[PDB]
Write an enzyme that holds these catalytic residues in place. Sequence first.
Site, mmCIF file in Angstrom:
data_model
loop_
_atom_site.group_PDB
_atom_site.id
_atom_site.type_symbol
_atom_site.label_atom_id
_atom_site.label_comp_id
_atom_site.label_asym_id
_atom_site.label_seq_id
_atom_site.Cartn_x
_atom_site.Cartn_y
_atom_site.Cartn_z
ATOM 1 N N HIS A 26 0.845 -1.226 0.000
ATOM 2 C CA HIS A 26 0.000 0.000 0.000
ATOM 3 C C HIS A 26 0.867 1.258 0.000
ATOM 4 O O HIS A 26 0.442 2.277 -0.529
ATOM 5 C CB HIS A 26 -0.972 -0.003 1.194
ATOM 6 C CG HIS A 26 -1.790 -1.234 1.289
ATOM 7 N ND1 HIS A 26 -2.756 -1.527 0.337
ATOM 8 C CD2 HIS A 26 -1.834 -2.205 2.224
ATOM 9 C CE1 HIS A 26 -3.350 -2.658 0.670
ATOM 10 N NE2 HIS A 26 -2.803 -3.090 1.836
ATOM 11 N N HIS A 67 5.290 7.080 6.684
ATOM 12 C CA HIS A 67 5.077 6.668 5.288
ATOM 13 C C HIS A 67 4.545 7.872 4.534
ATOM 14 O O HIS A 67 4.278 8.927 5.145
ATOM 15 C CB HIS A 67 4.102 5.489 5.209
ATOM 16 C CG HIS A 67 2.765 5.871 5.745
ATOM 17 N ND1 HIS A 67 2.452 5.732 7.069
ATOM 18 C CD2 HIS A 67 1.706 6.492 5.175
ATOM 19 C CE1 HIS A 67 1.256 6.269 7.303
ATOM 20 N NE2 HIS A 67 0.762 6.746 6.137
ATOM 21 N N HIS A 125 1.841 9.140 1.087
ATOM 22 C CA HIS A 125 0.837 8.914 0.029
ATOM 23 C C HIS A 125 1.223 9.827 -1.124
ATOM 24 O O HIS A 125 1.644 10.978 -0.871
ATOM 25 C CB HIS A 125 -0.596 9.193 0.505
ATOM 26 C CG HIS A 125 -0.963 8.482 1.767
ATOM 27 N ND1 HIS A 125 -1.684 7.312 1.750
ATOM 28 C CD2 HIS A 125 -0.656 8.731 3.069
ATOM 29 C CE1 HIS A 125 -1.843 6.885 3.001
ATOM 30 N NE2 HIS A 125 -1.228 7.726 3.825
ATOM 31 N N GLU A 177 -3.611 13.369 0.770
ATOM 32 C CA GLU A 177 -4.895 12.908 1.339
ATOM 33 C C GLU A 177 -5.686 14.124 1.823
ATOM 34 O O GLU A 177 -6.789 14.387 1.319
ATOM 35 C CB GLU A 177 -4.602 11.900 2.444
ATOM 36 C CG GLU A 177 -3.907 10.666 1.916
ATOM 37 C CD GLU A 177 -4.226 9.405 2.684
ATOM 38 O OE1 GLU A 177 -3.915 9.374 3.894
ATOM 39 O OE2 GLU A 177 -4.770 8.465 2.066
ATOM 40 N N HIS A 205 3.096 11.101 6.567
ATOM 41 C CA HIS A 205 2.417 10.805 7.834
ATOM 42 C C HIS A 205 3.406 10.188 8.806
ATOM 43 O O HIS A 205 3.917 9.080 8.549
ATOM 44 C CB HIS A 205 1.253 9.841 7.614
ATOM 45 C CG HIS A 205 0.139 10.445 6.851
ATOM 46 N ND1 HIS A 205 -0.839 9.705 6.221
ATOM 47 C CD2 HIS A 205 -0.181 11.755 6.674
ATOM 48 C CE1 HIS A 205 -1.685 10.548 5.676
ATOM 49 N NE2 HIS A 205 -1.312 11.801 5.922
ATOM 50 N N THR A 258 -6.560 6.495 7.538
ATOM 51 C CA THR A 258 -6.992 6.778 6.156
ATOM 52 C C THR A 258 -6.946 5.520 5.291
ATOM 53 O O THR A 258 -7.246 5.614 4.098
ATOM 54 C CB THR A 258 -6.123 7.884 5.549
ATOM 55 O OG1 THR A 258 -4.779 7.409 5.554
ATOM 56 C CG2 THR A 258 -6.265 9.201 6.294
ATOM 57 N N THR A 259 -6.620 4.367 5.871
ATOM 58 C CA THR A 259 -6.764 3.058 5.200
ATOM 59 C C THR A 259 -7.591 2.184 6.108
ATOM 60 O O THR A 259 -7.628 2.414 7.325
ATOM 61 C CB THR A 259 -5.423 2.365 4.980
ATOM 62 O OG1 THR A 259 -4.797 2.059 6.232
ATOM 63 C CG2 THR A 259 -4.501 3.186 4.112
HETATM 64 C C1 LIG Z 1 -3.332 -2.324 14.524
HETATM 65 N N1 LIG Z 1 -3.934 -2.881 13.328
HETATM 66 C C2 LIG Z 1 -3.071 -2.924 12.187
HETATM 67 C C3 LIG Z 1 -3.341 -1.681 11.352
HETATM 68 O O1 LIG Z 1 -3.687 -0.466 12.035
HETATM 69 C C4 LIG Z 1 -3.224 0.568 11.153
HETATM 70 C C5 LIG Z 1 -2.648 1.747 11.601
HETATM 71 C C6 LIG Z 1 -2.188 2.706 10.702
HETATM 72 C C7 LIG Z 1 -2.290 2.497 9.322
HETATM 73 C C8 LIG Z 1 -1.775 3.514 8.307
HETATM 74 C C9 LIG Z 1 -2.868 4.521 7.929
HETATM 75 S S1 LIG Z 1 -3.303 5.663 9.132
HETATM 76 C C10 LIG Z 1 -2.581 7.035 8.378
HETATM 77 O O2 LIG Z 1 -2.448 8.147 8.786
HETATM 78 N N2 LIG Z 1 -2.135 6.712 7.045
HETATM 79 C C11 LIG Z 1 -2.315 5.249 6.713
HETATM 80 O O3 LIG Z 1 -1.987 4.863 5.647
HETATM 81 C C12 LIG Z 1 -2.857 1.335 8.906
HETATM 82 C C13 LIG Z 1 -3.325 0.388 9.785
HETATM 83 C C14 LIG Z 1 -5.338 -3.361 13.189
HETATM 84 C C15 LIG Z 1 -6.271 -3.180 14.212
HETATM 85 C C16 LIG Z 1 -7.588 -3.623 14.029
HETATM 86 C C17 LIG Z 1 -7.935 -4.260 12.841
HETATM 87 C C18 LIG Z 1 -6.975 -4.416 11.846
HETATM 88 N N3 LIG Z 1 -5.733 -3.971 12.053
HETATM 89 ZN ZN LIG Z 2 -0.975 7.704 5.832
#
Ligand SMILES: CN(CCOc1ccc(C[C@H]2SC(=O)NC2=O)cc1)c1ccccn1
Ligand SMILES: [Zn+2]
Length: 258
Positions: A62, A92, A94, A104, A117, A196-197
Site C-alpha cells: 500500500h 510513510h 501517500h 490525502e 504521515h 486513512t486506510t
Molecule cells: C493495529 N492494526 C493494524 C493496522 O492499524 C493501522 C494503523 C495505521 C495504518 C496507516 C494509515 S493511518 C494514516 O495516517 N495513514 C495510513 O496509511 C494502517 C493500519 C489493526 C487493528 C484492528 C484491525 C486491523 N488492524
Molecule cells: Zn498515511
Amino acid sequence: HHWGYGKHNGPEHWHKDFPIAKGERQSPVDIDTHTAKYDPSLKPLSVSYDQATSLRILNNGHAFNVEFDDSQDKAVLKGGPLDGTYRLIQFHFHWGSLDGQGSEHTVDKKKYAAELHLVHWNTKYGDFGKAVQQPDGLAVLGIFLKVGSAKPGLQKVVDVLDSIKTKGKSADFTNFDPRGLLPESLDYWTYPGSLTTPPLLECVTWIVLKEPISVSSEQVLKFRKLNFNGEGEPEELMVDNWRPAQPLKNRQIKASFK
Ligand SMILES: CN(CCOc1ccc(C[C@H]2SC(=O)NC2=O)cc1)c1ccccn1
Ligand SMILES: [Zn+2]
C-alpha cells in the site's frame, strides 16, 4: 479480492468490508483555511526526535513504512492539542501518478504531490494495537510535499526504494533522522479523525502542518517506480495510494496560528 486503490477495490468500495468508512470522524478532509478557527489555547507542538531509532523500511503493498523502535520514549510528540506522550512507530507517504495529486488532506481543495504521515501512539495505552481502539489513541503528524527543490533529508529514503520494489520486501534502515523531513515552521491545523486506510478506525488526533516541504521531481518520480504487486506478479505501479477527502460532518478544524 482485498482492499486497495484500484477501480475495483479502491476507496469507494471500502465501506462493504469496513462500514466505519461512512462514519462520523473519517479522514482525510479538506482544510478550509478561511473556516478553520484560530485557537489561542493551542500549545506549540513539541517534536522530540533527537533519540529516534529507525530500524527497517517495508513495502507493505500500500505504501512503504519506515519503522522505529517504539519500545521506549525515544522519538515522541507532545504538546499542541495533545494530552500526554505519543511515541513514533513509523512514517510513510501517500503520492500521486502526477504532481497535481497525491495528498490525502487538501487545503482549500488544493492537492499536493504527496503527504508524509508520522504515526505516533499514546503511551497511556501500552501498545499500538490497544491505542487504535481508543478515540485519543494515535497522533498523526501530516506534512505536505510540493515539487521544487530537493529535500536533502529525504534522499536516503529515495535511494533504498530500489531494494523494496515489491510488496513484502524490507531492508535495513538504521540511523535515519526524521528531523530532516520537517519544514521550518510547526504551525498546524488539528481535528479529530481516523486512519486513512482500512480498518479506518476513529482513533486519530490529526496535526497537519501549514508549511509544506519541497522535494524534487526526481525524488517523487522514484516513489512512483515502486510496485503494489509482489515479485513475479504483473507490474502495478504504486501510485495514487491516497484516500480522497471525506465529509467533515460535525467537526471543527482548529488553527494554531493567525
Ligand atoms: C493495529 N492494526 C493494524 C493496522 O492499524 C493501522 C494503523 C495505521 C495504518 C496507516 C494509515 S493511518 C494514516 O495516517 N495513514 C495510513 O496509511 C494502517 C493500519 C489493526 C487493528 C484492528 C484491525 C486491523 N488492524
Ligand atoms: Zn498515511
